[PDB]
């Protein structure tokens, strides 16, 4: 119909774009191990899939959050199924990304001048462990609730700010429904965002930058 | 709580993962790629 | 009344200082 | 069969990219569709594939309600969490443990500013940077193994 | 009940001097 | 005639620094608000809690609640803390080593920490085990039916001297 | 509740030509 | 009256659709106005002005059917912690608008649910309360904020008495179908007026129906009209009025520190503007842009 | 005093931007820090200042809590959704509704495929569509106004 | 020490972003009312902080979700003076949204090449409005629940998907705890991802393409 | 020789196919997942609900809670229903203009929606009003000491044929 | 519910700002900018 | 023994914290493992096998004090909804595996909480338990997931008796602060061997303590100890073991379709490796990329 | 309860014909 | 048994489809 | 819980080998 095509490229520069990605190449050294990082970035989209598909139906509630949680796994349709994904895929992305830092490091690609990449690197990875620590407690089970009420007192050793950290990430003096509030927004709102603008970034230099050299 | 499936996992790819990169390595060192280095 | 004193006041203060630093910024070799 | 492509050494802008170790994307299999349209589904759909796999075969557990007044025996977070958890158990000085545990992400981020004495990437040419790698990683399973066992035999792996 | 007053004639004297501060800064409008 | 270096720069503090100023005001609020609010202690704390936290009464407790004194109870701060013809002190049952609950064993008159063994004494003194400080001590006076909590400002019962949560 | 939102009204439509005649003002004593 | 809607109506004169319980027996609609401030400081008296207006010269029908004059009457339900002030909180000026009010509670403990009962419309359709707003410094329950004031303002005399019987200011229909025999007027027992109304042409009921006078009848004799014909009309010419308004209790210290950044916003914009102007003295030198 | 710079028309690629209507950041004031650095934060701040000025001044009220069995009197959205809600109530055809619902959008939509027919910029260059533009909005004010009122006074505003 | 600047620059290529930026110029035809999209701009943003603030103590269930605004008004640090700035900047968000398609309008900026970009503004809009809508009833007071429960019902109009539509907006046969999660759900995770994703598109094409020509 | 567009053309069909049957394969679960699960329907609805979800008893509604019965009640679909010496039918109390609450007038004996000026009858059916179609009617059958509710199968019991909302 | 205060601004600024459009648009109509058009 | 345990714990033998309540009485601590399948099918038959094994070729102490073989016992708490399989629902083979093993119930309605009393632990070091899986399909209450097993699994003679007297089986202190004066070994009433024993050297109290022979004394005569040396030692040879473990209740279909799902992918992989195939090839040929 | 067993063997299966087809389509590795 | 039958068949019978789709498809001159 | 651990290691571990093989044998059979 007077084609479509020609209209989207006219303003979008289509043409320039396939250009750009037809022009890169991968080197003969880029083995499969390679593939680590793209793999934890699947892992993550499994994640954000699931995880938004479980907020339609989990309750961030002292009183309702456990139940909501038998509710997925029970009445949901294939409620069972997104939960477990989002189970197995939460350990599967820290896992995937830990071979991906045993890749990057037994090849040097931390080095100059990628060395920004690998200290957004390491923030990804202090990010994901946040994602893990504040979803292990959601289900607000005896293993989840307790693997709060131990960490969250840790902060406290620091002389003068520690009690003010414990206190914002627990949102009190104790672990209770201020805690789970907190430690949800952080799971559903801080720790998406976050890891986006810092994924954004990984993935930007590496493009900028292209794949390290051979070993 | 520990589990083992999941444990057994972890432990395996850490394993030939760390013994694949070694041996990827290697095979460098022995017969250098083009700009090897 | 005191509302639009006020408000008359105000901006008759703010434009007091704009034309105060300005000219006083000029005198001072800044601007 | 098998495309590749030469890196075009007449070109000086290539050069300068690759004299700051910086053009590797200029030459070798053309990236796409060889395997970003074609090699990249297959490691998304196998990855998810066996992902949904052990979510049928062995699905989420949800164990029992929360309570503030009971313990439980077995107390432990996630796995990836075990080597600090043994640190932060097993040290009797609280402060130092929070700092052993900061100490990972900071010392982390140091490395690329403490190897940069040198521009090897094979760990062949490195063989100190690859004994601290492998001495840390042997230290790190070490204690994440320590912390499902008992406080007694953690220093020990209940081994000898 | 002046300190009420005056709370509102500054969202007043806000408005018209972001408006006026736009004006000079960029030369017109 | 043009303004130089010196100029320009001391105008971009002056100007910048303003903007600042804005912006902490702006900020300011902010902080405060992530900041939980106190837990209302318009005094030193009060109430006791049972598991459903409700409040907890003598008339019930004393009368038929134990033929050997030593329960659980909602204490301040949220704490879990035993109440042992009532106790006047009160004893925080979490752990000082990582801070698991610690169950009462009768037996043996001590509290014995179940994660890594550690156990404590009658009052509330580290006997043994990998903690280091002891259980906190609270004042407790049963005003009205209820029990009444407040913190312990006063030196240590057990080692004489100044206490480790105050 | 109408006399408040024809005050409302007036007000946001007529502090702007205020804003205005202020912002050209500082425009002719700065030397525009 | 006001007074009948909490021998009614204990609880509260506010059902939960927000309707208020006069319309129960007050059935017409009249506009009712109201004026408070927008905003108020705390433990501060504050003029709170119901208007419930209508057309003084028209009179309408007095218990027994004579024509007289009506009185208004009013709820004002204001936030927690707002009542009635004190009378020697109340200044010279305001005593003077105030009048001969008799401001009384809706129950224990209600006192921020003002009810002012009969008084003369042709002298209060604009009532004046005098109200005294709570202090959150001393009231924990007590906090900053905007909150709600309900407002019901009745003229002229209901419609129905608290036991169900009807008064005689509404409009009266027919008993059943048939032809109109009687336009009598018979009395007995009490005193004034009274007329007795019957139909038949065939039925399956032997009874008349009685109208208290004071409306007045537009039907003549003999005409076989339906149940629910008009044989009266409307001498109704009050009603009750409802209106929502809300008040804010101001806090003096946020509208203080309120006005300090405010200040410091139109500072920092003034050395924006003045930097660039130093810019452009700048880049007319310089010429590289 | 008022820094500018002048279209260079000897640039065939700033030429076949302008061809395309599409170079106009090209020439004028510099952006930066001109506009960006210094006007923006005026802006910024001011617009930041009138909402925060209107937040203590006029601060969000609470209700009272939701009753499923106690329908209010006067049931409104928020202003920017009255034309629309005044349209959805005064139509008796819930379909039609909808659609007209969708309408609005959908025909915003389609504003840049139909006025494609021209290429001029200026309203008074093109009567027509200011004409429509005027007359959508005088319809629009005119059925906002008409929710808050009764619906026997929407087809006129209650003022004939 | 040794130039932080020039080792940032090396590898970021800071020089090449300020050259771009600075290659940039405003024509005398860009008028105050071009500035009302990127107020638009700063009444999300301020959202964005005040909404991610709220979620600190505000709670998503038919119990709590009163006493939370309740709790957030009256109890939490200026969390009085965060909710109504988040109130009123809803609105100044719509009102400048609303301006700056009168300003787009009424100067061409809409026509060829920049269609794509108006006709993200409209999905822009949808979604603005759906943000208003789905907050409106957080506080679950009775404007904000009968508010729902009378727009939820109208999808049914639709012939045959009309049931199905209303139903998954609602999270059932009628308004209650589903329709509560659901609504947080879309007002702090699925609104601001998809908000976030239209308006990047908005802001490259029209950093692409550049302003609209003189009138 | 080499394959042509024709053939490359068809490996396309049949590769990305297959790729598309795993998408949709993964995307079933997902689409069904967000449909509500059914509300436990096991016959045709059941008990109704007071106002806080509880469980309504004809020992406490006959008895004494009305001298002129009509009252709201947690119906089907958790939608509010009037309950008329029981009576047989329910009356669905939402508007069937746009969904507001009708509220009952003994005083006319009509339902009267405040919201546009609807009214109804004493069995629920528009006498006037913007409304369109009738309140929903519904079975009563008083099973046990608590109340039964089914939906209307059957034909119309005011307009003589087929309902509207089934 | 409906906000006189809120109603107030939004009908003020509308009106404002639609009438300076066209003011501002009627400028460029009698004096055209370089490439006016 | 189990049947102590429901009777004094009869709401379960579980405390809130994981604690299997046998501990409260058998102190001693010995490993007991479990063997459960990964996943069952619903209405399956499967074995469940707790392990209590211990030095068979040590012997304990008996009641009186004679050194006796000990028996094993153990507690099974499976998922709601699971039981011991019915007789006739269980194979031979699994027949012959079991035994002489009277598995019974904790209570009534709680079939999923077996307990299995006193068996010859030279025989039972081993037992198994016939389990049928519930069924999803015919009980609303059931459904398809992971469920918690925990077992608690015990061999050898307790320490404490329901009603508070210790028994013979374990380690005995001394009494008070003294001078051991006596190992005298008298009788009475009942029968077998006892032992007195005392102490003084000055004090605030003037008795003695007995102790029932059994464990053995390592003391001789005359020592001022203080209270709780051990003047016997610890004859106990047995212990309590918890473990916890998992298992699935797994739906057929759920296995079918992702067998399917998962061959689905494998060809999609095969096809996109075939396409690049054929890309080569043209990327050969007509050299542009 | 051969189904369970084919169950995790198609796990198995998935996971060594990823590897597999990784291999086959990148030539090596 | 049963695990390693179905495990070796498995990937017989797809290494089996693998080759008859490769062979098949370049008989067809589609490869 | 032991055995299963040592049985996944053992799997993930050897399996790899398994499909680099087949790969490998692929590769053979289409010419590389
Ligand atoms: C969610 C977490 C992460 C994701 C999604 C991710 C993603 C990626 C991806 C897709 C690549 C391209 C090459 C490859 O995939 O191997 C890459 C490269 C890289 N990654 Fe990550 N990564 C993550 C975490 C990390 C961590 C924890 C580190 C270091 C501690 C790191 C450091 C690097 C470096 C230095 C490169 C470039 C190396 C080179 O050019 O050869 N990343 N990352
Ligand atoms: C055989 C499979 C893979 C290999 C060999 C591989 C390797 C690489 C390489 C060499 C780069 C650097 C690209 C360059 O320098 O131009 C890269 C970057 C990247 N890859 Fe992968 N990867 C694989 C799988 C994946 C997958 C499945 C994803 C899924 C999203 C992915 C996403 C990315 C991303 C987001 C980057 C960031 C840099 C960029 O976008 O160019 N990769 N990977
Ligand atoms: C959250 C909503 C929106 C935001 C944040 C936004 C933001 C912006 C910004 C910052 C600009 C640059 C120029 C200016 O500010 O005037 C712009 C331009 C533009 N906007 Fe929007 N906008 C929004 C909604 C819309 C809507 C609803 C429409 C149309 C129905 C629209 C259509 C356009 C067009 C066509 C331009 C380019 C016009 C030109 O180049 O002269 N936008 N937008």
Chains 1, 10 share one sequence.
């Not at chain 1, 202090?126 to 609730?145: A, K």
């Not at chain 2, 060192?29 to 090897?36: F, M, S, V």
């Not at chain 3, 009344?1 to 000029?26: D, K, Q």
């Not at chain 8, 419309?121 to 906090?143: C, R, T, W």
Request: aromatic share 10%.
């Amino acid at each position: 119909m007077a084609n479509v095509y020609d209209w989207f490229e006219e303003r979008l520069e289509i043409q320039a774009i396939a250009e750009d990605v037809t022009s890169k190449y991968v080197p003969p050294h880029v083995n499969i191990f390679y593939c680590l990082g793209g793999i934890t970035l699947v892992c993550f989209l499994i994640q954000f899939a699931t995880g938004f598909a479980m907020t339609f139906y989990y309750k961030p509630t002292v009183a309702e959050a456990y139940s909501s949680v038998q509710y997925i796994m029970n009445e949901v349709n294939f409620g069972w199924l997104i939960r477990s994904i989002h189970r197995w895929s939460a350990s599967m992305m820290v896992l995937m990304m830990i071979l991906h830092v045993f890749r990057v490091y037994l090849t040097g690609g931390f080095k100059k001048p990628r060395e920004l990449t690998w200290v957004s690197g390491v923030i990804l990875a202090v990010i994901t462990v946040s994602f893990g620590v504040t979803g292990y407690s959601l289900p607000w089970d005896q293993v989840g609730y307790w693997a709060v009420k131990i960490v969250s007192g840790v902060p406290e050793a620091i002389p003068v700010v520690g009690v003010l950290i414990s206190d914002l990430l627990r949102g009190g003096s104790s672990v209770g429904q201020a805690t789970l509030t907190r430690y949800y927004s952080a799971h559903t709102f801080v720790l998406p965002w976050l890891i986006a603008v810092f994924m954004l970034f990984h993935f930007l230099m590496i493009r900028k930058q292209g794949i390290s050299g051979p070993l | 709580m520990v589990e083992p499936l999941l444990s057994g996992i972890v432990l395996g790819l850490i394993v030939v993962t760390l013994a694949g990169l070694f041996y990827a390595a290697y095979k460098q060192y022995k017969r250098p790629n083009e700009l090897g280095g | 009344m005191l509302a639009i004193v006020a408000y008359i006041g105000f901006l008759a203060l703010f434009t007091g200082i704009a034309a105060g630093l300005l000219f006083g910024l000029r005198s001072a070799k800044i601007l | 069969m098998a495309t590749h492509k030469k890196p075009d050494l007449s070109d000086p802008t290539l050069r300068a990219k690759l004299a700051k170790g910086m053009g590797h994307n200029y030459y070798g299999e053309p990236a796409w569709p060889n395997d970003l349209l074609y090699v990249f589904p297959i490691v998304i759909m196998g990855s998810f594939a066996c992902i949904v796999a052990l979510a049928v075969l062995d699905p989420a557990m949800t164990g029992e309600p929360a309570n503030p007044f009971a313990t439980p025996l077995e107390i432990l977070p996630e796995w990836y969490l075990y080597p600090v958890f043994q640190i932060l158990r097993s040290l009797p000085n609280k402060l130092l443990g929070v700092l052993a545990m900061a100490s990972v992400p900071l010392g982390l981020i140091l490395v690329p500013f403490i190897e940069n004495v040198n521009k090897f990437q094979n760990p062949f040419r490195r063989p100190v940077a690859t004994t601290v790698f492998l001495f840390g990683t042997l230290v790190t399973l070490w204690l994440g193994i320590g912390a499902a066992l008992p406080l007694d035999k953690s220093l020990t792996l209940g081994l000898f | 009940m002046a300190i009420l007053t005056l709370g509102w004639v500054s969202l007043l004297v806000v408005f018209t001097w972001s408006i006026a501060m736009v004006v000079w800064g960029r030369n017109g409008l | 005639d043009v303004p130089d270096m010196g100029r320009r720069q001391f105008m971009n503090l002056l100007t910048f620094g303003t903007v600042t100023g804005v912006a902490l005001g702006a900020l300011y609020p902010v902080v405060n608000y992530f900041i939980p609010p106190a837990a209302g202690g318009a005094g030193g704390g009060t109430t006791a809690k049972d598991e459903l936290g409700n409040d907890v009464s003598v008339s019930k407790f004393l009368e038929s609640h134990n033929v050997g004194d030593r329960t659980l109870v909602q204490g301040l701060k949220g704490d879990p803390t035993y109440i042992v013809a009532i106790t006047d002190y009160g004893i925080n049952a979490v752990c000082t080593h990582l801070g698991c609950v610690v169950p009462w064993n009768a037996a043996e008159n001590k509290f014995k920490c179940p994660c890594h063994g550690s156990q404590y004494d009658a009052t509330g003194k580290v006997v043994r085990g990998p903690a280091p400080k002891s259980l906190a001590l609270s004042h407790a006076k049963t005003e009205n039916d209820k029990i009444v909590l407040t913190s312990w400002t006063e030196t240590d019962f057990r080692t004489g001297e100044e206490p480790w949560w105050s | 509740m109408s006399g408040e939102l024809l005050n409302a009204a007036l007000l946001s439509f007529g502090l702007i030509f205020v804003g205005w005649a202020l912002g050209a003002l500082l425009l002719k004593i700065q030397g525009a | 009256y006001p007074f009948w809607a909490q021998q009614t109506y204990p609880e509260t004169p506010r059902e939960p659709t927000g309707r208020i319980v006069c319309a129960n027996c007050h059935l017409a609609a009249k506009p009712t106005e109201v004026e408070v401030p927008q905003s108020v400081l705390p433990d501060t008296v504050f003029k709170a002005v119901v208007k419930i207006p209508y057309d003084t010269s028209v009179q309408q029908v007095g218990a027994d059917g004579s024509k007289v004059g009506l009185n208004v009457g009013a709820v004002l339900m204001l936030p927690e912690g707002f009542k009635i002030a004190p009378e020697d909180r109340i200044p010279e000026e305001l005593k003077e608008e105030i009048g001969d009010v008799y401001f009384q509670p809706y129950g224990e403990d209600k006192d921020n649910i003002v009810i002012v009962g009969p008084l003369p419309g042709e002298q209060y359709q604009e009532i004046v309360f005098p109200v005294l707003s709570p202090n959150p410094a001393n009231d924990k329950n007590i906090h900053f904020g905007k909150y709600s004031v309900h407002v019901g303002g009745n003229r002229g005399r209901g419609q129905v008495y608290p036991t169900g019987e009807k008064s005689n200011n509404n409009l009266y229909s027919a008993a059943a179908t048939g032809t109109i025999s009687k336009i009598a007027k018979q009395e007995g027992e009490d005193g004034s007026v009274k007329y007795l109304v019957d139909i038949k042409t065939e039925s399956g009921e032997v009874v008349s129906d009685t109208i208290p006078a004071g409306p007045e009848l537009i039907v003549s004799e003999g005409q076989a009209v339906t149940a629910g014909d008009a044989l009266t009309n409307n001498p109704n010419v009050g009603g009750f009025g409802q209106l929502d308004a809300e008040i804010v209790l101001q806090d003096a210290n946020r509208v203080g520190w309120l006005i300090a950044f405010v200040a410091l916003v139109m500072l920092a914009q003034v050395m924006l503007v003045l930097k660039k102007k130093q810019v452009e003295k700048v880049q007319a030198a310089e010429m590289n842009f």
